[PDB]
Amino acid sequence: GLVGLLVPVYDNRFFSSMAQTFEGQARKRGLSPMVVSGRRDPEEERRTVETLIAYSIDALFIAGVTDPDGVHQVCARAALPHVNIDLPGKFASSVISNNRHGAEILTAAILAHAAKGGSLGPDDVILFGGHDDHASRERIDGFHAAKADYFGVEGGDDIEITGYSPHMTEMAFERFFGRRGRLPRCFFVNSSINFEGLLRFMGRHDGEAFGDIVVGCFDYDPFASFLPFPVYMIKPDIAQMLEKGFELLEENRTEPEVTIIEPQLIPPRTALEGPLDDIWDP
Amino acid sequence: GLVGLLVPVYDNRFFSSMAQTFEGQARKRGLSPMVVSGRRDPEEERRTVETLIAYSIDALFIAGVTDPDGVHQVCARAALPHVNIDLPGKFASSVISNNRHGAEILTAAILAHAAKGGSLGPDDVILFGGHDDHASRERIDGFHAAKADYFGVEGGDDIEITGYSPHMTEMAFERFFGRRGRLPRCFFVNSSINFEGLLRFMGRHDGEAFGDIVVGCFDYDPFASFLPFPVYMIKPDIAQMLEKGFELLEENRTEPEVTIIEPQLIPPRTALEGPLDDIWDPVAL
Ligand SMILES: OC[C@@]1(O)OC[C@@H](O)[C@@H](O)[C@H]1O
Ligand SMILES: OC[C@@]1(O)OC[C@@H](O)[C@@H](O)[C@H]1O
């Protein structure tokens, strides 16, 4: 009963939390859980799945792959049950978080917090992110939706196109800080990995107070929650996503179904109880 | 060429970065890397490897397991190449960090930083953590060595014994906050997993002043580095540990050898490059 979870990286705070949740859920099913990395490379993702098929894994969870179709064909040729997690696929059923709604409540929350510091203008509210993923594009849509309702206007240049990688995000923060002289008063970071780019930027500018900023991040991390600026985070319901990923694998419907799970807004300085219960007891 | 890394949990920041480093090195070796968790339970650790053996895994990295010897006996029956990482085992080769020395330099750094705010007394310097773990005992020893050298005295009553668990650590900070009315000016947190307990404690006491603190944590995380209070972190050279872990897998020498890798002290507000390079550049399909 070997079941595999395919993730882009182990180092990611969201995917690392998913792997912990996945292992426990698989353990309760009596399955044996293994995690493999696709390294966000379609060829690597295909080779990794082929290796898992060669080693006779029973089921695969496909989480955050850049190419869902190529992975599906490999699983289909091997007749290996697979469900998409987090990022949708057309051929197989997908369980994903409600990125648009999560971004909307996140943007509304950081807008309300920043406004307590002083009235805002649309040029004050910026998103660092990208169009490469359905989740990322959905996040910009929720972000624009909350801004449009708040300001009553839309269509400003509020998107700083940054790559999921922190280095491109760091350069964006460096570039923005260069013309404006400050960080935006209210800004949205697309991912926890993007958030690392902000820290790289901040480390380069020791001696800057960065006191006027309010930040909203997709993905949750207790350490990021307690950062010296107020940080609002969206925590996806990974457990429900995996629970639906399971049971969807049991079920034989050929028709692909996309199931959307509502995320939860996390206020600043919140340290939540984690998936590891009594694992770290002596 | 399936090569496995066995970790206690996926969620831990040290083990998650280790899995990232392990994935890259294994890929360069032309191996196929996969990670499994032992949940710090000896029976599940052994049962997990037994299953990997049944599926004919080629090599295994044993990282932070509660029962290194029992895992070794399981590997030995299958003649499966294995090296212990981070936590030593007597029967198989181990690559471990220099926990005692890293703890010593960590304590010296936070002592120096805390002292710059005001003279210290030995009761101001506390450690939250400690475990039957070899790393934990070595860390407590390095902590005591640095305190004794600084103060010129020892036998202070400065170790708050907690499991790795955040909840027990949170209770430890809570009890300390009850007696003192504040957090200690200088304290050492054994693990990044313990560190969550400190955040849980702070979250429980919103609007309450904890006092001015300097914190040293073993293990490194960029977010934890940038916490509003100064956090000094020890970063183990995970890349070297795994490189030494490989090739130790290649060698057929029966004799167990423990290789000690020096960790690096990280000052507050430091963001590293990490083990992920180019992975997050856009694919555009
Ligand atoms: O940090 C995790 C992340 O960047 O991964 C890629 C996206 O699918 C989404 O899960 C996002 O949260
Ligand atoms: O979180 C990692 C850690 O705290 O766990 C206990 C030890 O294995 C040691 O590696 C230490 O780094």
Q: Are residues A132 and A222 in the same domain?
A: yes
Decide if A260 is inside a domain.
Answer: no
What is the C-alpha separation between A64 and A218, in angstroms, rounded? 14
Answer with the one of A92, A118, A144 that is the final residue of a domain.
Answer: A92
Q: Exposed/middle/buried for B54, CB within 10 Å: 0-12, 13-18, 19+?
A: exposed
Q: Which residue has the tokens 């490989």?
A: B246
Give how many domains chain A has, as a whole number. Answer: 2
Sheet harboring B2-7: ordered strands across? Answer: A258-261, A94-97, A82-85, A59-63, A2-7, A32-37, B32-37, B2-7, B59-63, B82-85, B94-97, B258-261
How close B254 gets to chain A, by Cα (Å)? 29
Query: Ligand 1: distance of its center to the CA of A70 in Å?
Result: 19
Q: Are residues B36 and B135 in the same domain?
A: no
Q: Are residues A158 and A176 in the same domain?
A: yes
- Among B2, B11, B195, pick the best mutation site for testing chain A contact (most A Cβ within 10 A): B11
Taking every pair of C-alpha atoms in chain A, what is the biggest distance, in angstroms?
60
- Among A276, A277, A278, A281, pick the best mutation site for testing chain B contact (most B Cβ within 10 A): A276
Tell whether B153 is within 8 A of chain A (Cβ): no
How close A106 gets to chain B, by Cα (Å)? 20
Residue B16 structure tokens = 């998650």
What is the C-alpha separation between A165 and A266, in angstroms, rounded? 24
Q: Is the CB of B279 less than 8 angstroms away from the CB of A8?
A: yes
Beta carbon of B219 within 6 Å of any ligand 2 atom: yes
Q: Are residues A55 and A116 in the same domain?
A: no
Tell whether B225 is within 8 A of chain A (Cβ): yes
- State the SS3 of chain A: CEEEEEECCCCCHHHHHHHHHHHHHHHHCCCEEEEEECCCCHHHHHHHHHHHHHCCCCEEEEECCCCHHHHHHHHHHCCCCEEEECCCCCCCCEEEECHHHHHHHHHHHHHHHHHHHCCCCHHHEEEEECCCCHHHHHHHHHHHHHHHHHHCCCCCCCEEECCCCHHHHHHHHHHHHHHHCCCCCEEEECCHHHHHHHHHHHHHCCCCCCCCCEEEEEECCHHHHCCCCCEEEEECCHHHHHHHHHHHCCCCCCCCCEEEECCEEECCCCCCCCCCCCCCCC
Decide if A50 is inside a domain.
Answer: yes
Q: Are residues A173 and A128 in the same domain?
A: yes
Query: Ligand 1: distance of its center to the CA of A238 in Å?
Result: 12
Choice from B128, B191, B234 to test ligand 2 binding pocket (greatest atom count within 8 A of CB): B191
Q: Which candidate, A195, A184, A95, A189, places its Cα nearest to that of A139?
A: A189
Decide if B275 is inside a domain.
Answer: no
Query: Ligand 2: distance of its center to the CA of A138 in Å?
Result: 38
Closest-CA residue of chain B to A14 = B11
Residue B215 structure tokens = 């914190």
Q: Do A219 and A238 touch, CB atoms closer than 8 A?
A: no
Strands A231-235 and A264-266: antiparallel
Domain that holds residue B55: 2-92
Answer with the one of A235, A254, A275 that is the final residue of a domain.
Answer: A235
What is the C-alpha separation between A81 and B121, in angstroms, rounded? 62
Choice from B9, B21, B98, B218 to test ligand 2 binding pocket (greatest atom count within 8 A of CB): B218
Q: Which candidate, A239, A278, A244, A275, places its Cα nearest to that of A258?
A: A244
**Within 13 Å and on the Cβ side, how many CA atoms surround B192?**
24
Answer with the one of A218, A235, A252 that is the final residue of a domain.
Answer: A235
- Residue B22, domain CATH: 3.40.50.2300
Cα separation values, A242 from A56, A91, A213, B178, Å: 21, 19, 35, 40
Q: Are residues A88 and A213 in the same domain?
A: no
Q: Are residues A158 and A217 in the same domain?
A: yes
Closest ligand to C-alpha of residue A162 is 1
Strands B231-235 and B214-218: parallel
How many CB atoms are closer than 10 A to CB B4?
A: 25
Q: Are residues A58 and A165 in the same domain?
A: no
How many CB atoms are closer than 10 A to CB B78?
A: 16
Q: Are residues B180 and B86 in the same domain?
A: no
Chain B residues lying within 8 Å of A235, measured CB to CB: none
Decide if B279 is inside a domain.
Answer: no
Closest ligand to C-alpha of residue A9 is 1
Q: Are residues B59 and B113 in the same domain?
A: no
Q: Exposed/middle/buried for B56, CB within 10 Å: 0-12, 13-18, 19+?
A: exposed
Q: Which candidate, B256, B278, B246, B219, places its Cα nearest to that of B22?
A: B246
Residue type (1 letter), A239? A
Q: Is the CB of B224 less than 8 angstroms away from the CB of A223?
A: yes
Cα separation values, A167 from A39, A189, A194, B41, Å: 17, 14, 8, 39
Decide if B251 is inside a domain.
Answer: no
Q: Are residues A127 and A227 in the same domain?
A: yes
Decide if A241 is inside a domain.
Answer: no
Decide if A124 is inside a domain.
Answer: yes
Decide if A257 is inside a domain.
Answer: no
B79 — alpha (psi -120 to 50), left (phi > 0) or beta?
left
Q: Are residues A173 and A58 in the same domain?
A: no
Tell whether B281 is within 8 A of chain A (Cβ): yes
Query: Helices A68-77 and A42-54, interaxial angle, to 10°?
Result: 20
